[PDB]
């Protein structure tokens, strides 16, 4: 009601406001030890708990250094030697992450990790990836790296151990760039392998480390996908494309859940506003040169027609434009098309004398 | 080959602008070789349409 | 100061007098005190740590003993409270503006 | 001012921006300003090239 | 994080940059002998293994 005559002065400083979406470059590192049980939340590269084993500290050191940039966040978990797989999966389900590796794993451990990832990426609708020492999976989220007798720091590293450095290198690089032909100064020796059979190995969906020109460089980082179905793309078995698709999926899901679920009615105007918001997000993503701006978002007419015929109403009288504006109950259907860019990898040049 | 493998491999996205920049770089190298007087002065480099 | 030991509480009087003495145009950062002659020795990284804490401490550099980058006590920065609020000169001039208006 | 006028339930849909500014608001007065505060020099970066 | 103010002086020398091309004019000669097996690295005309 009435108050005393009150005058106030507000002191406010404008700050750079950018909506913050899902964080990329995070690494979930899991390992077994008898000291410092639980997650170690190593936010900074330099600081490491001292009670950890020297070997595992060294593997952490491989994880810390990055090809392009130091990984933004690292999460290291320590578990007791018995039941290595249960609570690791429980904590992974609890908290979001991007990449993972197992320096010490049994074959059953690898199989359990692969099956859990396949189950989660579909049932939970959570996009995650991991690097494993030796797998034969056909999924996009599993990376099969296999290079024997890696010798770094005058030390004999097995195929399963060096995957920590592989995962750190993959997570360190930004989305725009790619891992193909990235040199590792630390690696000094590799067993000699012929070019044709190494190419066959790459064709197997397998990731290998090969040597050419002056340095040791990765050869076309690709997923473990081997068989191509009609629905899924050949471009799926590339890494960068999967990474950017996962980023887009996570961002759109977060925005939708936070804003448009349960807060506004379902009408044609609200559908148009949601389409405009999604298009604005795609335009925002465009400037990062990840995708092209030609992408369009529109109402999926086929899905709406299917919904109405499932209801059983007769749509013959209604005009085709009217059908799109018809009420759809709780459900909302949208359709979009995009194109995903990639880095230049194959170049053909011809000159006329 | 050395310039391409060192600079423009796996570091820049495949797009029309990047292709134009690559053409500019190749043309600059060819101009440098022209200054050496080993090749003819007038050289043309462009994206191939048939392929 | 003056062949005498002083606690921090006792010397806060001199610190406040020094702060009030300076004009609005110039900042208290890097101003020498010819009265003090000695302070217990302490490493530079520790001084950086205390400055990061928001603690105002007396440091030794160059020829003369000087205060270093006097800052406001708050260390937690909220969305509304900007970085510039952490400086003494800025908050002082904002306060005088508020009072006059 | 728009929020205050809406709080009293007035129909401000058809009035112009200038009309909204000129509208009566009762005892309340709303104002906005922006200023930049200068600061004394703290850190100096100098790079010399041979 | 607020740091104690400091002055920094950087000394740098501008260097003329010419992109490095593949070295041309090098010679690799292979021969069979019982002494100094492997490469000899005769960069200079004057220095010869005995």
């Amino acid at each position: 009601a009435i108050g005393l005559p009150s005058i106030n002065i507000s002191f406010k400083e404008l700050a750079t406001t950018v909506k913050e979406r899902s964080a990329r470059g995070i690494i979930a590192m899991v390992l077994k030890d008898a000291k410092a049980l639980g997650l170690n939340e190593i936010h900074e590269k330099e600081d490491i708990p001292v009670d950890l084993s020297a070997e595992n500290k060294e593997y952490i050191n491989l994880a810390l250094m990055g090809n392009v940039n130091t990984p933004n966040k690292l999460l290291v978990y320590v578990i007791e030697g018995e039941a290595d797989i249960q609570t690791a999966l429980d904590f992974l389900e609890t908290k979001e992450f991007n990449y993972l590796c197992m320096p010490k794993a049994v074959e059953a451990d690898k199989t359990a990790i692969k099956n859990w990832i396949i189950k989660l990426r579909d049932i939970d609708k959570v996009k995650v990836k991991a690097v494993l020492g030796k797998v034969v999976g056909n999924h996009e989220g599993i990376i099969n790296f296999t290079t024997e007798d890696v010798l770094v720091g005058e030390k004999k590293y097995s195929v399963d151990e060096f995957t920590s450095r592989v995962a750190g290198l993959i997570a360190g690089t930004p989305l725009s760039q790619s891992v193909t032909y990235t040199k590792l100064s630390d690696v000094v020796d590799i067993p000699k392998m012929t070019k044709v059979d190494a190419e066959s190995r790459v064709n197997k969906g397998e990731l290998i480390l090969i040597k050419e020109a002056g340095a040791i460089r990765i050869a076309r980082g690709v997923n473990s996908l081997t068989e191509l179905t009609a629905e899924k793309g050949e471009m799926f078995q590339k890494i960068k494309i999967v990474d950017t698709l996962d980023i887009i999926h996570s961002d759109i899901r977060k925005v939708i859940i936070d804003d448009y679920i349960g807060k506004v009615t379902n009408s044609y105007d609200n559908k148009c506003l949601l389409i405009v918001a999604i298009k604005s997000y795609l335009e925002e993503l465009e400037k990062s040169a990840l995708i092209e701006s030609d992408s369009t978002v529109e109402i999926d007419f086929e899905a709406q027609k299917s919904y109405l015929k499932s209801k059983g109403v007769d749509l013959s009288y209604m005009t085709l434009q009217e059908i799109k504006e018809a009420n759809t109950g709780s459900k909302v259907f949208l359709k979009a098309k995009i194109k995903v860019l990639d880095a230049m990898e194959d170049i053909d040049l011809s000159i006329e004398i």
Side-chain angles (χ1 to χ4, degrees), chain A:
Chain A
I2 318 181
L4 64 81
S6 61
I7 62 170
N8 54 348
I9 306 305
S10 178
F11 289 113
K12 291 168 163 293
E13 170 167 2
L14 295 178
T16 308
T17 62
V18 176
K19 188 176 182 59
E20 302 304 340
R21 327 194 175 282
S22 309
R24 54 221 181 171
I26 187 180
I27 309 182
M29 162 46 98
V30 62
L31 199 44
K32 81 211 185 306
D33 270 319
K35 272 57 70 172
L37 279 76
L39 73 164
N40 302 117
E41 64 268 12
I42 317 180
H43 312 147
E44 181 64 28
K45 159 175 52 184
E46 181 63 31
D47 293 354
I48 295 297
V50 287
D51 53 355
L52 295 173
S53 299
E55 176 182 358
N56 302 2
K57 189 182 310 303
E58 159 68 4
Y59 288 128
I60 288 185
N61 290 349
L62 280 72
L64 290 171
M65 81 205 168
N67 54 6
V68 177
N69 300 115
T70 309
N72 199 3
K73 206 49 59 183
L74 173 62
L75 303 175
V76 168
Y77 184 68
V78 170
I79 189 180
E80 185 63 28
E82 298 70 10
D84 277 309
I85 193 66
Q86 277 63 234
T87 193
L89 269 61
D90 305 349
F91 279 127
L92 294 174
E93 185 169 350
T94 303
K95 179 176 52 179
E96 64 180 2
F97 70 105
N98 289 170
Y99 292 104
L100 181 140
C101 168
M102 211 55 247
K104 319 295 179 175
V106 306
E107 295 77 5
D109 183 13
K110 296 300 208 310
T111 303
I113 293 179
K114 160 191 174 180
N115 302 337
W116 171 77
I117 284 186
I118 298 177
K119 166 264 177 182
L120 180 137
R121 289 182 64 93
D122 298 4
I123 295 307
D124 287 330
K125 283 303 172 297
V126 178
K127 314 302 178 178
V128 289
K129 296 154 273 162
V131 181
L132 294 175
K134 177 45 205 69
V135 288
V136 72
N138 263 309
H139 204 271
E140 308 90 4
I142 181 51
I143 282 151
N144 179 7
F145 161 67
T146 301
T147 298
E148 279 60 37
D149 301 332
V150 165
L151 196 150
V152 183
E154 58 265 22
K155 200 265 182 185
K156 182 71 166 62
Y157 274 131
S158 58
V159 60
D160 299 334
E161 301 294 350
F162 182 76
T163 67
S164 175
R165 172 51 179 166
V166 168
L169 182 142
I170 295 183
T173 193
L175 300 172
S176 177
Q177 294 178 0
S178 185
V179 306
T180 296
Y181 285 169
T182 310
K183 63 182 72 178
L184 284 76
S185 298
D186 300 331
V187 183
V188 69
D189 193 307
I190 299 94
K192 181 67 177 68
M193 187 66 204
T194 180
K195 312 319 290 193
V196 58
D197 210 14
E199 208 57 18
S200 176
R201 294 239 178 108
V202 162
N203 278 40
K204 305 295 283 186
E206 201 181 18
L207 164 56
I208 61 179
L209 180 49
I210 204 55
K211 66 177 179 67
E212 66 87 20
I216 310 300
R217 285 188 290 274
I218 311 297
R220 293 178 65 88
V222 288
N223 293 4
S224 300
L225 180 54
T226 308
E227 283 194 348
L228 277 296
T229 77
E231 183 175 1
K232 78 199 313 173
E234 159 190 353
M235 291 215 268
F236 262 78
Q237 63 184 356
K238 306 275 296 176
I239 302 185
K240 169 178 175 293
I241 299 174
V242 175
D243 202 313
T244 177
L245 292 183
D246 293 11
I247 294 296
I248 298 172
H249 176 285
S250 82
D251 295 347
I252 296 170
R253 183 165 191 264
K254 177 175 181 178
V255 172
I256 283 180
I257 279 182
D258 281 0
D259 286 22
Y260 288 83
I261 286 293
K263 302 193 182 304
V264 288
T265 64
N266 188 349
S267 75
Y268 186 81
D269 273 315
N270 273 328
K271 288 181 176 178
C272 290
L273 295 196
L274 174 53
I275 286 174
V276 171
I278 286 186
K279 181 165 194 51
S280 175
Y281 167 64
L282 282 185
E283 168 193 323
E284 180 175 11
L285 262 185
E286 189 276 331
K287 304 193 331 303
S288 292
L290 304 176
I291 71 170
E292 184 48 31
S293 51
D294 60 342
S295 56
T296 69
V297 185
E298 51 174 323
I299 301 293
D300 185 1
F301 199 65
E302 313 155 307
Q304 188 152 324
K305 179 180 300 293
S306 61
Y307 180 61
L308 275 296
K309 68 180 178 66
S310 63
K311 289 298 188 53
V313 311
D314 197 359
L315 78 173
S316 171
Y317 263 120
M318 294 182 286
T319 312
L320 207 50
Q321 178 60 251
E322 159 62 8
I323 304 173
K324 183 172 75 178
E325 214 168 32
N327 184 9
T328 43
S330 298
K331 298 300 181 302
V332 177
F333 313 85
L334 302 177
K335 160 73 74 166
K337 64 184 185 296
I338 69 176
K339 210 47 192 173
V340 181
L341 295 182
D342 195 349
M344 294 182 286
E345 295 183 11
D346 309 318
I347 299 183
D348 294 343
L349 187 145
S350 280
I351 62 170
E352 293 179 353
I353 311 289

